[PDB]
Design a binder for this molecule. Sequence first.
Ligand code: CYC
Ligand code: CYC
Ligand code: BEF
Ligand code: MG
Ligand code: MG
Ligand code: MG
Ligand code: MG
Lengths: 302, 301
Amino acid sequence: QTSRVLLIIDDSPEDRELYRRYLLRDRDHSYTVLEAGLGRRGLELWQQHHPDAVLLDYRLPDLDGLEFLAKLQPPPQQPYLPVIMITGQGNEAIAVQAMKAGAQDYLVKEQITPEELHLAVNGAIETVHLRTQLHQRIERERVVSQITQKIHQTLDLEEILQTTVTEVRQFLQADRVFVYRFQPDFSGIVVLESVGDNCVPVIDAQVEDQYRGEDYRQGRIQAVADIYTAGLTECHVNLLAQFHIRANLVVPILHADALWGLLVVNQCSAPRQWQPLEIDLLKELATQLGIALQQAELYQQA
Amino acid sequence: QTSRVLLIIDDSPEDRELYRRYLLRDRDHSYTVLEAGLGRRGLELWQQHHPDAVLLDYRLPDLDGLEFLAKLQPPYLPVIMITGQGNEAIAVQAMKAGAQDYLVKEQITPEELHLAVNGAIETVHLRTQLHQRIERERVVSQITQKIHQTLDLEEILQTTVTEVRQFLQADRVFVYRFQPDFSGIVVLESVGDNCVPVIDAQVEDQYFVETRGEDYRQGRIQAVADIYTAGLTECHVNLLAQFHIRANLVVPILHADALWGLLVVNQCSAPRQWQPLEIDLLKELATQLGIALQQAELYQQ
Ligand SMILES: CCC1=C(C)/C(=C\C2=NC(=C\c3[nH]c(/C=C4\NC(=O)[C@H](C)[C@H]4CC)c(C)c3CCC(=O)O)/C(CCC(=O)O)=C2C)NC1=O
Ligand SMILES: CCC1=C(C)/C(=C\C2=NC(=C\c3[nH]c(/C=C4\NC(=O)[C@H](C)[C@H]4CC)c(C)c3CCC(=O)O)/C(CCC(=O)O)=C2C)NC1=O
Ligand code: BEF
Ligand SMILES: [Mg+2]
Ligand SMILES: [Mg+2]
Ligand SMILES: [Mg+2]
Ligand SMILES: [Mg+2]
């Protein structure tokens, strides 16, 4: 089977073949290798087939490796380049500029062993992952921290709610995020919504659906990757599909101990396996809303 | 020109000297170089100096490279294994044992060495930041949870103080509440044995009665690494010195727009540089305490 897809860009065919053979010496992974001899073709292959790692030559006919890294645009989800510059025509200065341009590692051509190549590719892939994890931790901290500041400033509840749904949708890159407030009637209306183009907006287009909030009062969440494989009742499925909802993430909002409403995230383009980081964030945000809700009524009865 | 401390562990005096000369050629960092010809002394020097990076020769008289790594106790090792050509099998085992990179003794160039040392420090730094952020988020979440559950100030304060002292691994954290006349009084305190408790022994300082802490009220933060090198006023350093305070971190706690108190962190065993991430953590927590203060005050009325 294929475990890793790797893109080699080098105007030397024999050099590409050498890497190809060395990679086969790796007993941990099986590499599928894309080859390109020109920088522009390398860009096309990268953009089209999303290799897990890139071996990038410095001196190429159409453009040098440094120009290449500058043109290389990383996908929103993981914005770091798994690129290893390998050159027989380079120095520590080019190495520094390569590292600055987004390369993860830098190798001299003559000294490359199979094992060195393996570890450089492993290191590049792992380092990109590491930077990505750190990148998201920072963004998650910013979102949570921003809401805390708004509560502390005693900003109106809906501004806090509007900021919440907007910022959490941008972070998750989801198609729709909305707050679903319950009434004393136990009826619920979508109070607030942040929606892209993949979803049918429901803020206005909405007639009431009724439910048993035993789980949501207990603080339990619903994490559905695919509405068609979650074993939902078909009526429930029909309703979600009617709004093109494919993946569903529901987090309960608790004011006092009463169930106030729901913090809901939707993917409408395709199914989506919700990740621990994403769920933990929504939970924290839900808790903060519960705080803001309590502050609101204490201020009102003052 | 930031300073770096590197530990070289090799039983060949000529090899150690060679790498030393190679490190010095790098002009982006100034290298303090420590040397050990035996693994035992290497481990010893590692324990004492906490070097930014380690060059570990595989073949030592008393250990091999892999045996060395196993004897290490950190959270991630900035170790570069140095092995001879033909022994690349050892290199793979080394990575799985904690090493960040490896070098082939015969193909060692100064440029190559610099990249490896940079990369090792870079990678270890990233994991440390990631680990710190995960821990940092846990502390913010706990205080967020307790505020949502109860409006009990002293318990929220207690949880806060206790939690940030453990995260920072500081010698003392305490809350300094103001009186209406802007006299202060340490109301809560979490402390180890490195710092003598000041919870009942407070010397009442009245600096703030003239100033009414207006600077702190706007959001001034004090982050002093060493009270003896911070250019503090002679009377101020002596007060901190009385309580063995070496490093000082003060963040204002504000209820609404009025100064309420101070969240203070002390290092007493040694000078301590306060990191942006650490400072940011205290800033957020003071904001959280202000929120707790707001609801607790409204709860009474
Ligand atoms: C704009 C968006 C909007 C929604 C999403 C909404 C209704 C809606 N129905 C829900 C659940 C549900 N709704 C139904 C069932 C039904 N629903 C029906 O319209 C039926 C009559 C019925 C079949 C009996 C069920 C079974 C659930 C899940 C209850 C549970 O197990 O938690 C939920 C919470 C769980 C989820 O979102 O998946 C909502 C928010 N009304 C809205 O305006
Ligand atoms: C247990 C620990 C404890 C402390 C730290 C405390 C007093 C104390 N004095 C402070 C500031 C200060 N204290 C002084 C001055 C003085 N202070 C004096 O005791 C003098 C009489 C005097 C010289 C005139 C000054 C000038 C500051 C201002 C520090 C600043 O500007 O941040 C501060 C806040 C800033 C800081 O901690 O550096 C405290 C908490 N009393 C305590 O029980
Ligand atoms: F032609 Be490449 F820079 F080895
Ligand atoms: Mg070339
Ligand atoms: Mg040796
Ligand atoms: Mg290397
Ligand atoms: Mg690395």
